[PDB]
Amino acid sequence: FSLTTFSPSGKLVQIEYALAAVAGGAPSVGIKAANGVVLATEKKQKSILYDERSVHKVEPITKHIGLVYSGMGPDYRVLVHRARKLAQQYYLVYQEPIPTAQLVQRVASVMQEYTQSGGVRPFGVSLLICGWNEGRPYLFQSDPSGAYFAWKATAMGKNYVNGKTFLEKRYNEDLELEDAIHTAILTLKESFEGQMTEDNIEVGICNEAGFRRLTPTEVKDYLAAI
Amino acid sequence: GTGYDLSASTFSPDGRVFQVEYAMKAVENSSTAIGIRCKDGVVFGVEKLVLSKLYEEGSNKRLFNVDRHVGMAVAGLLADARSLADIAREEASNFRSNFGYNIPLKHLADRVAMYVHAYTLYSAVRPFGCSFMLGSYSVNDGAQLYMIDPSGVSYGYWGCAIGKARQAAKTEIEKLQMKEMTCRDIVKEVAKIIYIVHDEVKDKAFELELSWVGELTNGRHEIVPKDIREEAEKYAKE
Amino acid sequence: NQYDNDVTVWSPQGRIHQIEYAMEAVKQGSATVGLKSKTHAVLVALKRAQSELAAHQKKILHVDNHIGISIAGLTADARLLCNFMRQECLDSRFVFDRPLPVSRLVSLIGSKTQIPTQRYGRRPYGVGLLIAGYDDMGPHIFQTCPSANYFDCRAMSIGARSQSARTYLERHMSEFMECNLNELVKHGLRALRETLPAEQDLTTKNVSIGIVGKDLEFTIYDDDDVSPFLEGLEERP
Amino acid sequence: GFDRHITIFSPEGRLYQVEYAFKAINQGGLTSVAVRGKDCAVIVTQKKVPDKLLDSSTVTHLFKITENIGCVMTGMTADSRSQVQRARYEAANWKYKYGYEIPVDMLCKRIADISQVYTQNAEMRPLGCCMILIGIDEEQGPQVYKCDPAGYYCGFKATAAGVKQTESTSFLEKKVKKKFDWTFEQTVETAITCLSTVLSIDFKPSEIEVGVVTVENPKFRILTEAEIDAHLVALAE
Amino acid sequence: TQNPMVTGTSVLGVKFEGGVVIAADMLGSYGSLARFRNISRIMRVNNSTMLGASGDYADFQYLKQVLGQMVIDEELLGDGHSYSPRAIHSWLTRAMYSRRSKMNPLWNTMVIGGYADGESFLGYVDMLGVAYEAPSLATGYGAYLAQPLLREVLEKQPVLSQTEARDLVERCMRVLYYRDARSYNRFQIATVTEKGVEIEGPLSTETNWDIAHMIS
Amino acid sequence: IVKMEVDYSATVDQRLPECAKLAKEGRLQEVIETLLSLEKQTRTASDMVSTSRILVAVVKMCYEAKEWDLLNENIMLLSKRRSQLKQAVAKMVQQCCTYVEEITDLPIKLRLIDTLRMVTEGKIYVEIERARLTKTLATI
Amino acid sequence: TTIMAVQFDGGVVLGADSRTTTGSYIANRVTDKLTPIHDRIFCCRSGSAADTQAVADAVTYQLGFHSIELNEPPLVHTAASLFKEMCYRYREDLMAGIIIAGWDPQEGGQVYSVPMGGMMVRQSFAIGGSGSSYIYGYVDATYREGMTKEECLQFTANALALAMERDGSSGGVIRLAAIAESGVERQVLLGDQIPKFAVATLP
Amino acid sequence: RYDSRTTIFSPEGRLYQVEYAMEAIGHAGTCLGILANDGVLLAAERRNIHKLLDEVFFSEKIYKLNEDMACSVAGITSDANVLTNELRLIAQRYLLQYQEPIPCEQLVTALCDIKQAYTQFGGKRPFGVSLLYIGWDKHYGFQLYQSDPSGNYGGWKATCIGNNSAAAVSMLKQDYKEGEMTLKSALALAIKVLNKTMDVSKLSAEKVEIATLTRENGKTVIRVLKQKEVEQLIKKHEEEEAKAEREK
């Protein structure tokens, strides 16, 4: 009624429609490499009127937790605002644990106000989260109704199927260094229609040193020699 | 409409609120009114249909006093109109209690209009079935007159009319040359315009409720002395 | 017809339909008339009896020494309005020791009943009220309809077949200010008798009178108290 | 059903209520243009005044949200005023909570969040008014943003909203693709010629109301009749 | 409320044939300090009722605001009725009683004068909710000093004329100024009658100091 | 095209010949400027005949005072100010056509090309093209 | 500390000391006690510094919002009403003496006082603070009617100087603020510029 | 007219919404609990085994909910998460109140009471999740309980809750022997029934997750059998299968 609702006999029809909406069209690949995690996404603005340094698809929820998303950007904001408040509350209660990767699983779990309390209309965004404050990286996915999936590499876009196929075929693998971001950009290339450029593509990296949204300078540097 | 015109919270396929589009119809159906900003004040006027002679002297008057200097001439569903007038009185009293002095008419109209819009936004509550002019005068700000429709917003009016015959009234209002005519001749002319508008051609006899505000009344929005404005009604009759 | 289902919804043709149905609640009720005067207000109510064994029910409800009401319609949410009006009058008595003037009371009732006409899940108070009061400006008669739009009246009647009583009151209302108490009460009695079918006629058991005057506080006369008024009936059923 | 009646996800995987609400903005018959410049940010909307009994003094669609942020509304005027009031409340509350004035991007973000809450849930409905707010921000130059009934807040350099918004956006795209910065004259002339080409009436200097925020002169100058006339004379020269 | 800071000193008033006259000086005593010397402690409740107060002037201003607002609301309806001074006295009484019951008392002792229905009324209500009406009334040290003169005049003359009544009020004000520390030589005198409420203004009383030479 | 708001026929009748006398030889440009203000007033009042008469009087003054350059920039300003009234500008171009054909001179070629530039901004089939045709023939 | 306001033709002049005392130690010798509530409206604070700051900031909130929603500069009377309401509703908790002044086109230079308790009064001149109680006679005797801008400025500067030199809780520098239609001009008197009435008691 | 949920009866008198949810619990998920002396164990079927996961949560079906018990859901994960959180909260609240580990039956009764409330009053969906619990207490020793979304729990000793729960329970009934049952033979039975209910023979140790609760010296140890131990169990089962098949 005023929660995550509309579940018929052996189905969650409203949730299934929400996932149909989260099919979206922003590819937003994610790769969990040995050194860290890369969340890359496509910012294909309509016309040149819009700006790219104005709004962002990658959001640092805290010191080393970075977040990327899928369709329904208006819902994604609210979700990332809630996530920031949740990580901050956890850090305030358990004071000074520099909590990112021992907090990445926990924030993914506290992503239950995410959907288990939908809010009449469930959220329409599936989001990938990256963290590296455990000596090991973590890439999780939270979907408009499910929970932490703990991916190693995936995509959430209009062509997420062949994107994931590309990821496994190009062998997401386990020995890949931090610069699997090249492979991430390749995976985007597949689900991208245009000469992608620095403002066109937005990518964040979360390594053991912390999280950082790569500026257009580095994004263009990586896009060169592709 | 058919499917989409059931609750105001449901937008139309073209993007319209059919609940308000229908609430405007009640104002269009109810009896008319008029208000003219004279040179140094605002004069109201509204014909009231005496549906039965059983009623006493003019009661449930379409005019109301919302504050000391402010008056409200309303048309449409009269019960909700009165409740809205009470909302306006409460708003004026609250503003006087908080910020002192008297509530400026533009802000009063804006606040009551935002309140009305709150009642059309949601689903559980329904839009108000009334449209009303708020008229006021003061030495500092001259004379102001704002009309609020059942769902829209206040608009500054030199002269406005609402109700059964808006266009018929507005034609002769715009024919009249305001902004240099004193509130006396305006009080005559508003009665003239109301009587030009149909009163008994298809309906019963009508009562002429006329209201004043201006430096001739040093503010203090009050009903015009009906005994001495019966001659103004006579001049309208001629 | 879809648009007639709920009070909140608004008909495309204009006014809503649930409110218009609410007035039929007062239409479907026993008749009552109420008339002013120069100095008195009188209510005559046809106490509708269920069966000869049962009593003729209660109408013309009591509110205060100077105000008395007559209901016509849904009795359920009518004792509620009576409680509200009694409470407000007692509140006025408590705060500034003066009888609450009727007009202020009627405006309060109108505002109170207006809200259910706009709040979802709340039915309008489908009760016709004939308030008779004596404030400082002589006797007053007010009619309150479920559409929350009250009216002031020189003489008004509500109930089943009340149109005939309305017509009689209109035709004789010129000679209402200058009438003795008994003359006015007999005017009202004739008006009410003209309502019910020719087979029915006024009895001491099926009529109630509410009288409020300058020196006479509101009083509910009946059978015994009524016979002196019922005399000189001039019966033309 | 009710997929297209309430704010719920469509089986096809869309949200039809907000899709409708966007067309409400086109409804109402108005257009508005905003051009960011080298140093200033100028916006302009037509002032459709039917009959002169209205007060052209108060028919405007642009407002000061704070001392440096100016907004233009597009769509239903009641919702437009409600959102303007909300934005002013947010600006004042921000100035109270944090010492420095609210950045325009942050204000647009808060308004967008309010609208996103509205498109969430089912009791309320989205407000059919798209707001273009502009302001000078230090270390940022002029800044223009657009909040929409959905909650997507963005929009820059050249952005338009209203009935004929697409044609205006196309022309402004041509102009911005023409690589030359607009000074505090070319920006205004560009906005004026854009809106004029959209609605060719040659724009008598009384039917548009332009707001200007320069860097050396902050504040939301609602340019007067004389200023807009001077700009029109200079442009048509 | 709990501890007044700026207090207004005494106010008095007597009713006569066809009208009432009250008087209050224009000093706001910040304890022993004559901080405010040009303040009015007399309010026009309506066209036919006046009110004065002694005590916390902030509380007096709040009551003035609330009562003026309720009078404005009453007159907005245009029902022809009004708040008779008896009803006003009752309303103030209850307000004060409600405040004491809530244990947030209003530090004001109030005198309400009025002339309605051709009969003068002169009410009295204090902080503790005690209220009554008497032909002569005074507050604070006024009830100790000026009141006895009013009582001894009224015992022999149950009814009074306006001119001698206001002369008596002026003499009582002179006595209060002579023998009250908080008093001041600037008082307003307000007269309610059938014609309405008329306030004279910053009246002053002449001081006599011949007895100053009786020191030696 | 657009409904007339405020006529100034009395004003132009009472003032224009007096202005012509005051600037019989055209040494004063304040007269030209004040008639420009008057015709701007009548244009904002959406009057066509008064504006056309003002433009005809201006070009007639330029004819009689034979200031060829000031004529060129004056007619440029008149045709380019806001476009004014199409009827009025078509008129003014017509009397300019009637005038340029009577004085041989050397820079009447410049006058012809100036009017050609004023009329070639468009509005050819609408609002008089025979003038442009005759100007091209005159250039030939 | 001491705060004072004077109304002249076409504007007002405000003078405040820069000292805020805590017990017998000088917490802040350069306190800025002339808080601009709006562009042409200023506040002088006395008493509990925290409470004064909170009340002034809340009123600045409400007044700026109200001015923006009217598209008109607010009235000094409206500001004083906001202060009186804020002080009166919370007088039992908030103990602060406030002097409001400013200029608005509606009336011009206006000055109001809201001491502890929550009363509002309009005065030609206003005086408050701990050190105010020592210059009442001087301010009352040496105040004329129709004084011009410079006369009011010098007279207020002198009154503040004497209040500072006499009261132990007042000292430091003097802040003056001249408010008029042209705008507000704020100046500071320090050290030698302080108008001094030396008391050279004979041996 | 406004939408109203269905928490009502049938013309016959059935709660068909609850029945549909309970049947849907059979769809998706597969868990089974077998009780034995000195050790009671749970086996779970790893539904999605895509190679792009990392298995860092260490447990998906089996959840440790208390020192002396562990549960396993078979429903919608959204409800499963909140139900496990509420279950742990209930157990720990009991521990706070009585300074003693909560008996398994009391814990299960609390959980089924919350589910009964969810299906009883208000316009709230029933919790579409059915879960097993294995635990040890002082009063009854090793206990196994199965709770359905209907809130009607049952004290079992060999049961399954997954898709082919009918086949699994038939296999358990055929090859279950009480008393003689011990931990190791219980493990053999569990892997055998899992191999039966999972069509692909030679089940990989990754597709099966099993956890055993055992009673050490005055202390309950809940060990989730890791990959090597699981596949060694698989190898022993394979040896038994080959021997039995060839000896005919």
Curated annotation (Swiss-Prot), chain A:
One of its GO terms (cellular component) is extracellular exosome. Coiled coil: none annotated. It comes from the Eukaryota. It holds the Pfam family Proteasome_A_N. Disulfide bonds: none annotated. Induction: Down-regulated by antioxidants BO-653 and probucol. Down-regulated in response to enterovirus 71 (EV71) infection (at protein level). One of its GO terms (biological process) is response to virus. The modification Phosphoserine is found at S7, S9. It is found in: Cytoplasm; Nucleus. Phosphorylated on tyrosine residues; which may be important for nuclear import. The modification N6-acetyllysine is found at K63, K164. The keyword Cytoplasm applies. Keywords: Acetylation, Cytoplasm, Nucleus, Phosphoprotein, Proteasome. The modification Phosphotyrosine is found at Y17, Y69, Y114. The keyword Acetylation applies. InterPro entries: Ntn_hydrolases_N, Proteasome_alpha, Proteasome_alpha-type, Proteasome_asu_N, Proteasome_sua/b. PANTHER family: PROTEASOME SUBUNIT ALPHA/BETA. Component of the 20S core proteasome complex involved in the proteolytic degradation of most intracellular proteins. This complex plays numerous essential roles within the cell by associating with different regulatory particles. Associated with two 19S regulatory particles, forms the 26S proteasome and thus participates in the ATP-dependent degradation of ubiquitinated proteins. Belongs to the peptidase T1A family. This is Proteasome subunit alpha type-2. It comes from Homo sapiens. The gene is PSMA2.
From Swiss-Prot, chain B:
InterPro entries: Ntn_hydrolases_N, Proteasome_alpha, Proteasome_alpha-type, Proteasome_asu_N, Proteasome_sua/b. One of its GO terms (molecular function) is ubiquitin protein ligase binding. Keywords: Acetylation, Cytoplasm, Host-virus interaction, Nucleus, Phosphoprotein, Proteasome. The modification N6-acetyllysine is found at K53, K202, K226. GO terms for cellular component: cytoplasm; cytosol; extracellular exosome; nucleoplasm; nucleus; proteasome complex; proteasome core complex; proteasome core complex, alpha-subunit complex. Induction: Down-regulated by antioxidants BO-653 and probucol. Up-regulated by bacterial lipopolysaccharides (LPS) and TNF. The keyword Phosphoprotein applies. CDD domains: proteasome_alpha_type_3. It is found in: Cytoplasm; Nucleus. GO terms for biological process: proteasome-mediated ubiquitin-dependent protein catabolic process. Pfam families: Proteasome, Proteasome_A_N. Belongs to the peptidase T1A family. PANTHER family: PROTEASOME SUBUNIT ALPHA/BETA (PTHR11599). Component of the 20S core proteasome complex involved in the proteolytic degradation of most intracellular proteins. This complex plays numerous essential roles within the cell by associating with different regulatory particles. Associated with two 19S regulatory particles, forms the 26S proteasome and thus participates in the ATP-dependent degradation of ubiquitinated proteins. This is Proteasome subunit alpha type-3. The lineage of its organism: Eukaryota, Metazoa, Chordata, Craniata, Vertebrata.
UniProtKB/Swiss-Prot annotation, chain C:
GO terms for molecular function: lipopolysaccharide binding. The modification Phosphoserine is found at S107, S174. GO terms for cellular component: centrosome; cytoplasm; cytosol; extracellular exosome; nucleoplasm; nucleus; proteasome complex; proteasome core complex. GO terms for biological process: immune system process; negative regulation of inflammatory response to antigenic stimulus; proteasome-mediated ubiquitin-dependent protein catabolic process. It comes from the Eukaryota. Keywords: Acetylation, Cytoplasm, Glycoprotein, Immunity, Isopeptide bond, Nucleus, Phosphoprotein, Proteasome, Ubl conjugation. Its main location: cytoplasm. It is found in: Cytoplasm; Nucleus. Glycans are attached at S107. Component of the 20S core proteasome complex involved in the proteolytic degradation of most intracellular proteins. This complex plays numerous essential roles within the cell by associating with different regulatory particles. Associated with two 19S regulatory particles, forms the 26S proteasome and thus participates in the ATP-dependent degradation of ubiquitinated proteins. Belongs to the peptidase T1A family. This is Proteasome subunit alpha type-1. The lineage of its organism: Eukaryota, Metazoa, Chordata, Craniata, Vertebrata.
UniProtKB/Swiss-Prot annotation, chain H:
It is found in: Cytoplasm; Nucleus. Pfam families: Proteasome (PF00227), Proteasome_A_N (PF10584). The keyword Phosphoprotein applies. GO terms for cellular component: cytoplasm; cytosol; extracellular exosome; intracellular membrane-bounded organelle; nucleoplasm; nucleus; P-body; proteasome complex. The modification N6-acetyllysine is found at K124, K173. It comes from the Eukaryota. GO terms for biological process: proteasome-mediated ubiquitin-dependent protein catabolic process. The keyword Phosphoprotein applies. Gene3D superfamilies: Glutamine Phosphoribosylpyrophosphate, subunit 1, domain 1. Keywords: Acetylation, Cytoplasm, Host-virus interaction, Nucleus, Phosphoprotein, Proteasome. Coiled coil: none annotated. The modification Phosphoserine is found at S10, S72, S170. Induction: Down-regulated by antioxidants BO-653 and probucol. InterPro entries: Ntn_hydrolases_N, Proteasome_alpha, Proteasome_alpha-type, Proteasome_asu_N, Proteasome_bsu_CS, Proteasome_sua/b. PANTHER family: PROTEASOME SUBUNIT ALPHA/BETA (PTHR11599). The 26S proteasome consists of a 20S proteasome core and two 19S regulatory subunits. The 20S proteasome core is a barrel-shaped complex made of 28 subunits that are arranged in four stacked rings. The two outer rings are each formed by seven alpha subunits, and the two inner rings are formed by seven beta subunits. The proteolytic activity is exerted by three beta-subunits PSMB5, PSMB6 and PSMB7. (Microbial infection) Interaction with HTLV-1 TAX protein favors NFKB1 activation. Belongs to the peptidase T1A family. This is Proteasome subunit alpha type-4. The gene is PSMA4.
